[PDB]
Structures are given as structure tokens and as C-alpha cells.
Short mmCIF file of all heavy atoms in Angstrom, two decimals:
data_model
loop_
_atom_site.label_atom_id
_atom_site.label_comp_id
_atom_site.label_asym_id
_atom_site.label_seq_id
_atom_site.Cartn_x
_atom_site.Cartn_y
_atom_site.Cartn_z
N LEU F 107 -113.18 -11.72 -16.78
CA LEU F 107 -113.41 -12.40 -15.48
C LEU F 107 -114.17 -11.45 -14.54
O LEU F 107 -115.10 -11.91 -13.86
CB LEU F 107 -112.08 -12.84 -14.87
CG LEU F 107 -111.51 -14.16 -15.40
CD1 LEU F 107 -110.05 -14.32 -14.98
CD2 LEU F 107 -112.33 -15.34 -14.92
N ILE F 108 -113.79 -10.17 -14.50
CA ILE F 108 -114.47 -9.13 -13.67
C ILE F 108 -115.95 -9.09 -14.06
O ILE F 108 -116.80 -9.16 -13.15
CB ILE F 108 -113.76 -7.76 -13.82
CG1 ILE F 108 -112.40 -7.77 -13.12
CG2 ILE F 108 -114.65 -6.64 -13.30
CD1 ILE F 108 -111.46 -6.69 -13.58
N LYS F 109 -116.24 -9.05 -15.37
CA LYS F 109 -117.63 -9.06 -15.93
C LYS F 109 -118.36 -10.33 -15.47
O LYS F 109 -119.47 -10.20 -14.93
CB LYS F 109 -117.60 -8.95 -17.46
CG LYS F 109 -118.91 -8.51 -18.12
CD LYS F 109 -118.77 -7.96 -19.52
CE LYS F 109 -120.10 -7.88 -20.25
NZ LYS F 109 -120.83 -9.16 -20.17
N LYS F 110 -117.75 -11.51 -15.64
CA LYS F 110 -118.38 -12.83 -15.36
C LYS F 110 -118.58 -13.05 -13.86
O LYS F 110 -119.45 -13.88 -13.52
CB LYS F 110 -117.55 -13.98 -15.95
CG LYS F 110 -118.20 -15.36 -15.93
CD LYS F 110 -119.26 -15.55 -17.00
CE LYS F 110 -120.45 -16.38 -16.53
NZ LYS F 110 -120.02 -17.62 -15.86
N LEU F 111 -117.82 -12.38 -12.98
CA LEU F 111 -117.74 -12.72 -11.52
C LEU F 111 -118.43 -11.64 -10.66
O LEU F 111 -118.84 -11.99 -9.54
CB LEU F 111 -116.28 -12.92 -11.09
CG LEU F 111 -115.64 -14.26 -11.47
CD1 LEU F 111 -114.13 -14.20 -11.31
CD2 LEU F 111 -116.21 -15.42 -10.66
N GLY F 112 -118.52 -10.40 -11.14
CA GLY F 112 -119.24 -9.32 -10.42
C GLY F 112 -118.30 -8.25 -9.88
O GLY F 112 -117.12 -8.27 -10.26
N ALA F 113 -118.81 -7.38 -9.00
CA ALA F 113 -118.22 -6.06 -8.65
C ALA F 113 -117.24 -6.16 -7.48
O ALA F 113 -116.58 -5.13 -7.17
CB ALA F 113 -119.32 -5.07 -8.35
N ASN F 114 -117.15 -7.33 -6.83
CA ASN F 114 -116.21 -7.60 -5.71
C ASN F 114 -114.91 -8.23 -6.25
O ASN F 114 -114.11 -8.77 -5.46
CB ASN F 114 -116.88 -8.51 -4.69
CG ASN F 114 -118.11 -7.89 -4.08
OD1 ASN F 114 -118.12 -6.70 -3.78
ND2 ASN F 114 -119.16 -8.68 -3.90
N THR F 115 -114.74 -8.21 -7.57
CA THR F 115 -113.60 -8.81 -8.31
C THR F 115 -112.59 -7.70 -8.62
O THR F 115 -113.00 -6.68 -9.20
CB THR F 115 -114.10 -9.52 -9.56
OG1 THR F 115 -115.15 -10.40 -9.16
CG2 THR F 115 -113.02 -10.32 -10.25
N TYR F 116 -111.33 -7.89 -8.25
CA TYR F 116 -110.23 -6.90 -8.42
C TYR F 116 -109.06 -7.57 -9.14
O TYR F 116 -108.69 -8.70 -8.82
CB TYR F 116 -109.86 -6.29 -7.07
CG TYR F 116 -111.04 -5.69 -6.34
CD1 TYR F 116 -111.84 -6.46 -5.52
CD2 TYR F 116 -111.36 -4.34 -6.46
CE1 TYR F 116 -112.92 -5.92 -4.85
CE2 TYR F 116 -112.43 -3.78 -5.79
CZ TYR F 116 -113.23 -4.58 -4.99
OH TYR F 116 -114.30 -4.08 -4.32
N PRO F 117 -108.45 -6.90 -10.14
CA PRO F 117 -107.34 -7.47 -10.89
C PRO F 117 -105.99 -7.33 -10.18
O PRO F 117 -105.82 -6.40 -9.40
CB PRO F 117 -107.33 -6.64 -12.18
CG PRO F 117 -107.79 -5.28 -11.71
CD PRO F 117 -108.81 -5.56 -10.62
N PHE F 118 -105.07 -8.25 -10.47
CA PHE F 118 -103.62 -8.15 -10.13
C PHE F 118 -102.80 -8.60 -11.34
O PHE F 118 -103.22 -9.52 -12.08
CB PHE F 118 -103.28 -8.96 -8.88
CG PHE F 118 -103.39 -10.46 -9.05
CD1 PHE F 118 -102.35 -11.20 -9.57
CD2 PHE F 118 -104.55 -11.12 -8.68
CE1 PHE F 118 -102.46 -12.57 -9.72
CE2 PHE F 118 -104.65 -12.49 -8.83
CZ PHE F 118 -103.61 -13.22 -9.35
N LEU F 119 -101.67 -7.93 -11.54
CA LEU F 119 -100.62 -8.35 -12.49
C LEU F 119 -99.29 -8.39 -11.74
O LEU F 119 -98.86 -7.33 -11.24
CB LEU F 119 -100.54 -7.38 -13.67
CG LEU F 119 -99.60 -7.83 -14.78
CD1 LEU F 119 -100.32 -8.78 -15.73
CD2 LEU F 119 -99.02 -6.65 -15.55
N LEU F 120 -98.68 -9.57 -11.68
CA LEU F 120 -97.31 -9.77 -11.17
C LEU F 120 -96.43 -10.24 -12.33
O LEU F 120 -96.78 -11.25 -12.95
CB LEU F 120 -97.37 -10.79 -10.03
CG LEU F 120 -98.05 -10.25 -8.77
CD1 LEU F 120 -98.54 -11.40 -7.91
CD2 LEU F 120 -97.11 -9.35 -7.99
N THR F 121 -95.38 -9.48 -12.62
CA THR F 121 -94.41 -9.73 -13.71
C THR F 121 -93.23 -10.55 -13.19
O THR F 121 -92.90 -10.42 -12.00
CB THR F 121 -93.91 -8.40 -14.31
OG1 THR F 121 -93.17 -7.72 -13.29
CG2 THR F 121 -95.03 -7.53 -14.82
N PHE F 122 -92.63 -11.37 -14.05
CA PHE F 122 -91.36 -12.08 -13.80
C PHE F 122 -90.21 -11.28 -14.41
O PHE F 122 -90.36 -10.76 -15.51
CB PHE F 122 -91.36 -13.47 -14.43
CG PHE F 122 -92.24 -14.49 -13.77
CD1 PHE F 122 -93.47 -14.82 -14.32
CD2 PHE F 122 -91.81 -15.17 -12.65
CE1 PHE F 122 -94.27 -15.79 -13.74
CE2 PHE F 122 -92.61 -16.15 -12.07
CZ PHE F 122 -93.84 -16.46 -12.61
N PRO F 123 -89.05 -11.17 -13.73
CA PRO F 123 -87.84 -10.67 -14.36
C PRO F 123 -87.16 -11.75 -15.21
O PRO F 123 -87.72 -12.83 -15.33
CB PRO F 123 -86.98 -10.25 -13.16
CG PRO F 123 -87.40 -11.18 -12.05
CD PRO F 123 -88.87 -11.48 -12.31
N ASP F 124 -85.98 -11.45 -15.77
CA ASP F 124 -85.29 -12.30 -16.78
C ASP F 124 -84.17 -13.13 -16.13
O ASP F 124 -83.57 -13.95 -16.85
CB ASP F 124 -84.75 -11.41 -17.90
CG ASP F 124 -85.84 -10.78 -18.75
OD1 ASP F 124 -86.85 -11.47 -19.02
OD2 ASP F 124 -85.67 -9.61 -19.15
N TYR F 125 -83.92 -12.96 -14.83
CA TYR F 125 -82.72 -13.51 -14.13
C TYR F 125 -83.08 -14.74 -13.27
O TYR F 125 -82.24 -15.18 -12.46
CB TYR F 125 -82.04 -12.41 -13.30
CG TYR F 125 -82.92 -11.68 -12.32
CD1 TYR F 125 -83.35 -12.27 -11.14
CD2 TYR F 125 -83.30 -10.37 -12.54
CE1 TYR F 125 -84.14 -11.59 -10.23
CE2 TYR F 125 -84.08 -9.67 -11.63
CZ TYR F 125 -84.52 -10.29 -10.47
OH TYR F 125 -85.31 -9.64 -9.57
N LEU F 126 -84.28 -15.30 -13.45
CA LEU F 126 -84.79 -16.41 -12.60
C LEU F 126 -84.63 -17.73 -13.34
O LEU F 126 -84.72 -17.79 -14.56
CB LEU F 126 -86.26 -16.16 -12.26
CG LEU F 126 -86.51 -15.07 -11.23
CD1 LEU F 126 -88.00 -14.91 -10.99
CD2 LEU F 126 -85.79 -15.38 -9.92
N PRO F 127 -84.44 -18.84 -12.60
CA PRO F 127 -84.52 -20.17 -13.19
C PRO F 127 -85.99 -20.50 -13.53
O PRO F 127 -86.86 -19.69 -13.24
CB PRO F 127 -84.00 -21.08 -12.07
CG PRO F 127 -84.43 -20.35 -10.82
CD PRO F 127 -84.17 -18.89 -11.15
N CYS F 128 -86.22 -21.67 -14.11
CA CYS F 128 -87.57 -22.22 -14.35
C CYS F 128 -87.84 -23.26 -13.25
O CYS F 128 -86.92 -23.48 -12.43
CB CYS F 128 -87.69 -22.79 -15.75
SG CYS F 128 -87.87 -21.50 -17.02
N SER F 129 -89.05 -23.81 -13.20
CA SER F 129 -89.46 -24.82 -12.19
C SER F 129 -88.52 -26.03 -12.30
O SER F 129 -88.44 -26.65 -13.37
CB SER F 129 -90.90 -25.21 -12.35
OG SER F 129 -91.73 -24.11 -11.99
N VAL F 130 -87.77 -26.27 -11.23
CA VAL F 130 -86.81 -27.41 -11.09
C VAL F 130 -86.94 -27.90 -9.66
O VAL F 130 -86.81 -27.08 -8.74
CB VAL F 130 -85.36 -26.99 -11.37
CG1 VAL F 130 -84.42 -28.19 -11.28
CG2 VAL F 130 -85.20 -26.28 -12.70
N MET F 131 -87.18 -29.19 -9.47
CA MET F 131 -87.06 -29.79 -8.13
C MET F 131 -86.67 -31.26 -8.26
O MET F 131 -86.77 -31.82 -9.36
CB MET F 131 -88.36 -29.65 -7.32
CG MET F 131 -89.58 -30.22 -7.97
SD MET F 131 -91.04 -29.66 -7.07
CE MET F 131 -91.13 -27.97 -7.65
N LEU F 132 -86.23 -31.82 -7.15
CA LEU F 132 -85.49 -33.10 -7.08
C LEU F 132 -85.74 -33.70 -5.70
O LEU F 132 -85.53 -33.00 -4.71
CB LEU F 132 -84.02 -32.76 -7.33
CG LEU F 132 -83.05 -33.93 -7.21
CD1 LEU F 132 -83.21 -34.89 -8.39
CD2 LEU F 132 -81.63 -33.41 -7.13
N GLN F 133 -86.23 -34.93 -5.66
CA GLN F 133 -86.29 -35.75 -4.42
C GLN F 133 -85.30 -36.89 -4.59
O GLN F 133 -85.37 -37.61 -5.58
CB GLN F 133 -87.71 -36.24 -4.19
CG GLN F 133 -87.89 -37.04 -2.92
CD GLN F 133 -89.34 -37.42 -2.74
OE1 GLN F 133 -90.25 -36.66 -3.09
NE2 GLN F 133 -89.55 -38.60 -2.19
N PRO F 134 -84.34 -37.08 -3.67
CA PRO F 134 -83.30 -38.09 -3.86
C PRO F 134 -83.86 -39.52 -3.80
O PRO F 134 -84.83 -39.75 -3.09
CB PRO F 134 -82.31 -37.81 -2.72
CG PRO F 134 -83.14 -37.14 -1.66
CD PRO F 134 -84.20 -36.35 -2.40
#
């Protein structure tokens, strides 16, 4: 993506821990 997009492109990596639920939501 850095190659395809140019020199103003910066990477990020955000990791998930093991103690979280998954996507759950509910409208009554």
C-alpha cells in the first residue's frame, strides 16, 4: 500500500487482546 500510494503513507498496527467479546448489538 505504501508503494502504491506514495511517500506520505505511514503504517499502523493495532493488536486485539484475548479477553474481548466479538461484535454483538441489539435493538429492542
Side-chain angles (χ1 to χ4, degrees):
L107 278 167
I108 289 160
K109 199 161 165 309
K110 189 76 218 311
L111 282 165
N114 299 319
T115 309
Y116 306 86
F118 68 85
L119 187 85
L120 290 159
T121 65
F122 289 102
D124 292 321
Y125 54 74
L126 286 179
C128 284
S129 292
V130 182
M131 56 192 75
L132 176 71
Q133 182 177 325

